[PDB]
Amino acid sequence: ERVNVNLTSIKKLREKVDDSIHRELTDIFANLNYVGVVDEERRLAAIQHDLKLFLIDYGSVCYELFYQIGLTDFANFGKINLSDDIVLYNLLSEFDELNDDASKEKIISKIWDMSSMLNEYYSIELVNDGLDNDLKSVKLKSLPLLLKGYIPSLVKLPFFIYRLGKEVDWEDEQECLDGILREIALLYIPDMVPKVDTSDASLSEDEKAQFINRKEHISSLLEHVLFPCIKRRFLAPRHILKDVVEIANLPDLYKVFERC
């Protein structure tokens, strides 16, 4: 059932991850006790490992986790099927940089030409309705399902499409495959929640309510879906050492509140 990947490019990409893994940093995640979100904008969360408290950049950790899952489950991904259809031409509207119809069409051309490759190896299914040369009728049917019980936020979807055409090097097997995995990982990481001043009376009741609901959504995601997965299978690369900081040593705190 599971399709065999004999690509040398993929083998070298997997060896690169394996040589980067830091044993002691991986031990902190392997036996973590999740506390909660510290900062939604800078994507910080606190965990306990043994009798030590840590500050973790979960944007950095999720980026590395989804890049690793992508490498593992390469060509063997499940699909996320997408009334409310998504058109690629309409997505690129968020960019004023592409001040031309042909400039927006050039991006879609690079992706549509590689529709077979993107659907087979990455489960990124692109469907055309009109003519083959016509790019206005190109829609996105499905996305890869990396983690069961998780649906990525499509806020980052117009940036995923833009980078797939503009950033990804389609002229080299290894650089191309590596770039698509990094683009999926960037899409898959939970969104940042910019800080909103709740005490300021000059902001509407909807603006403050939506911010609260955005904060509650990330909190539930990290606690129920992301941190259980991180704890279960995350391998920490040496370059992630800066994103894992010891904030407290609890035996030193027991001494402070030793007696009442």
Binding site: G36, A46, L250, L253, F257, C260
Partner: protein, 222 residues
């Protein structure tokens, strides 16, 4: 209309703090735009609860005393032998002891006949006459040595902490131990919702920075 700017800052600090969660079944991790002299703090869950409980006990005790509603249980066959100087000291502060439910009469190697005692003191004394004498003398000496000032009831919201200093040491000790005993302990499970309520109540306290026994209730870790 001048004030000292340092006093207002202490209250506004805790007010800007949102709860993260319980840490190691001992602490409540809290987090604080405009981060001037203030980010991450670990609150002792026992000290937090004990503090809230003490301020409730103090508020109840001083509301009763100030309104003349403090219960004074009638006591029988309680006569204490006192020195001439001790008898004069009790004669001098008879009016002061009545405010705390301690009712006596000075007789004649004199004798102190205790007629009434408040419920707290009745329980603690447990028939031990040597204990009761020591406890009443301690307060009488506190008053005479200007270490405790008398309860002024001439004044007519009640801010219990404006009278907190007048409370006899024996009453303080009883309330400190009741609050300690009723409080949540290290090792006890708390849901995020229970932690939210605990910190909300703590931020409404007159002194949220220490437990009932004067030890710190929280430590910044950021």
């Amino acid at each position: 209309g001048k004030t000292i700017t340092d006093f207002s800052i202490s209250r506004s600090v805790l007010a800007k703090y949102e709860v993260i969660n319980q840490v190691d079944k001992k602490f409540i991790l809290i987090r604080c735009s405009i981060h001037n002299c203030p980010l991450l703090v670990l609150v002792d869950q026992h000290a937090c609860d004990e503090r809230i409980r003490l301020e409730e006990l103090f508020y109840s005790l001083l509301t009763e005393v100030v309104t003349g509603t403090f219960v004074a249980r009638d006591l029988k066959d309680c006569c204490i032998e006192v020195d001439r100087t001790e008898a004069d000291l009790f004669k001098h502060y008879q009016s002061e002891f009545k405010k705390w439910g301690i009712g006596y009469e000075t007789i004649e190697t004199s004798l102190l006949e205790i007629k009434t005692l408040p419920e707290m003191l009745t329980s603690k004394y447990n028939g031990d006459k040597d204990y009761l004498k020591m406890v009443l003398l301690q307060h009488a000496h506190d008053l005479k040595d200007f270490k405790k000032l008398p309860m002024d009831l001439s004044h007519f919201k009640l801010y219990w902490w404006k009278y907190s200093s007048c409370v006899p040491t024996v009453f303080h000790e009883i309330l400190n131990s009741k609050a300690c005993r009723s409080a949540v302990m290290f090792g006890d499970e708390l849901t995020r919702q229970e932690c939210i309520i605990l910190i909300s109540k703590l931020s409404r306290c007159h002194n949220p920075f220490e437990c009932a026994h004067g030890r710190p209730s929280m430590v910044p870790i950021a």
